[PDB]
């Protein structure tokens, strides 16, 4: 009986070493982000004219993401900020049991954005879960804070949503529904 042994094709070592990395990256992440347009300007909120230009980029990114959400019927959030774009506020809509679940969310914009990501808060679900800092500041997967750092400064707030919050919802919210801390 022919036991499964390495058979030889016409691929070089590199054809392969490459093809490894096209299995060794996250397809989900790559899928998610491929759609979100990446940002350019490395400016933070004290950087005046440069900060505004980053801000236009942030708005463009978010727009195209909300717009991708609508296209795939996954319009799951709403956001806006003060004038200086340095302070943010919005709503997220989890569906679970064909039940809708709204939650109020709010984050600042660190001094050292875009290098340092912003810490989201959910001030109402404050206390009702275990992956949350005091006050309402969600604790994200370990994956994220490092992933963010490799891409700096290409990731912006739409990324912080689609990779950060977006995941954290599909975990906690199923959990708090069945635990009845929300109904």
Numbering used by the authors: 36 to 218
Cite, word for word, the article reporting this structure.
Analogous to ubiquitination, ufmylation is carried out by a three-enzyme cascade involving E1, E2, and E3 proteins. The E1 UBA5 has three distinct regions: (1) an adenylation domain that binds ATP and magnesium ions; (2) a UFM1-interacting sequence (UIS) spanning amino acids 334 to 346 that holds UFM1 in a trans binding mechanism; and (3) a UFC1-binding sequence (UBS) from 392 to 404 that binds UFC117–21. The adenylated UFM1 is then subjected to a nucleophilic attack by the catalytic C250 of UBA5 to form a thioester bond with the C-terminal glycine of UFM1. This is followed by a trans thiolation process, whereby the UFM1 is transferred to the E2 UFC1 forming a thioester bond with C116 of UFC1. However, UBA5 does not harbor such a domain but instead has a short sequence called UBS that is responsible for the interaction with UFC128.
Therefore, to gain structural insights about this region and how it interacts with UFC1, we attempted to crystalize UFC1 in complex with UBA5 347–404, but with no success. However, we successfully crystallized and determined the structure of UBA5(347–404) that is fused to the N-terminus of UFC1 to 2.65 Å resolution. The asymmetric unit contains one fusion molecule, and UFC1 interacts with the UBS that arrives from another asymmetric unit. As expected, the interaction of the UBS with UFC1 retains the same architecture as observed in the structure with the shorter fragment containing only the UBS sequence. In both structures, the UBS binds to the α-1 helix and β-1 strand of UFC1. However, for the linker connecting the UBS, we obtained electron density for residues 382–389 but not for 347–381, suggesting that most of the linker is mobile. V382 (the first built residue at the N-terminus of UBA5) is 35 Å away from UFC1 C116. While this distance is far from the active site, UBA5 residues 381–363 can span it, thereby we cannot rule out the possibility that the linker reaches the vicinity of UFC1 active site Cys.
